[PDB]
Amino acid sequence: PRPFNEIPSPGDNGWLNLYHFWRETGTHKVHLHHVQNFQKYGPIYREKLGNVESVYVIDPEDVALLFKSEGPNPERFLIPPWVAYHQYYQRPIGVLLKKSAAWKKDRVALNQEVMAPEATKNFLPLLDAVSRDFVSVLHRRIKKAGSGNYSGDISDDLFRFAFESITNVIFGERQGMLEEVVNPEAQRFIDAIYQMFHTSVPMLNLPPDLFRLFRTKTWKDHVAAWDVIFSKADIYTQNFYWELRQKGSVHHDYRGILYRLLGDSKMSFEDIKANVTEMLAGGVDTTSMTLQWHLYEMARNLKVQDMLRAEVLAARHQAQGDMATMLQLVPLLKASIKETLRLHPISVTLQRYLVNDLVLRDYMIPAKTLVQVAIYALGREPTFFFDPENFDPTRWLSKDKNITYFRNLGFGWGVRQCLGRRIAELEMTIFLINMLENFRVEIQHLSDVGTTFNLILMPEKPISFTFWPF
């Protein structure tokens, strides 16, 4: 068993490695940097960037070993500007920034309301209401254009849609972000979320001591974005708490996640408020970017779009209109979501700190090492996916249960996988059902759209769609 130091590497000087990364590839192209590194070093390597050293893997077979050796309270890589902000400005932390027993207590309480089938069934009509209103926005814009047609960049509208959805399931109340005249303070919350992510990038790979010294402007902007996030989330939670006491009525109808947690959970109010903040912020940029990519791949692959429409129409008929029943009759659509995340992951990597020593590819990796799975590079790798550039949803329906082995990694894995996974899957599946029933989607002057790293991975340039009523 080969020692750690023999794992291929650019070298042990983290600051020099950072220098070469910035010069040759650039901060906003870390995903390409991973691709290039596997081509240079093979299927496993180590790289110290600034202060942080990691081992990087790409093989699903190595991924399987990593996750099998996982302990009861897994830890991923913590974003240092996020940590520094919460510590310095003394903001209560939620499940994202907690560890061990304190993380477990939050997670178990939250899973009961946001992950469990018994809870999630209640999300359906709340998410369906928002998606139906999105459809109406588009029909209205089509009428106004006068051409039987609507063309536009809808990224801003997708951010608003994602915000309506997450707020509706949390608060059981519509915020009005899909109306013609919008709440400017809710729009300020949406913009801050984007800014928090974008401003995170120049501070990555640096200790907090170096942030304020060499990234002072960025840090200041980053602090301001988090302050907006916390101000507004706290106001929402505070108002809800008091209005609940003003209306003091037991409800038989479902009122949302916050009502459930305030009404009956082991969580303190302060843990609840901290987690509400993280759920709201997690709810905005991820599902909206993923949906945008999905529409892009449907416009790029019109045969696949047709197949998906036909399955949705059959499912609506078969279910006699019931959404709950429909969602079990659209396997190809759910596959196309897996396929969208394969090509366009939100998260460049998954990461785990090892609890015990571990052997990967005949190399000994000591306990406490950070191991990263390169999700983006895996998805483009022709040895792990047949024709990786092809958008092919049936790939996930293959009875060859080897082709999909540890491939579906967009939401992570295990007990500390994405907390919003069910919300996101349901929101996106329900959105696409309504869209496919109502419109055909095209891109005029279609061209390949690249990816940029803004903490989350994002389209590198605007995408302008054309929608035809179907």
Add this chain to the structure above:
Amino acid sequence: GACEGTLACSTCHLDEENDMLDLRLGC
């Protein structure tokens, strides 16, 4: 059963269930 019966892991291995299985469930 680490996630404790909420379909949020796969430690109880004895569409959503199908995906947890690729990476029957006891809960």
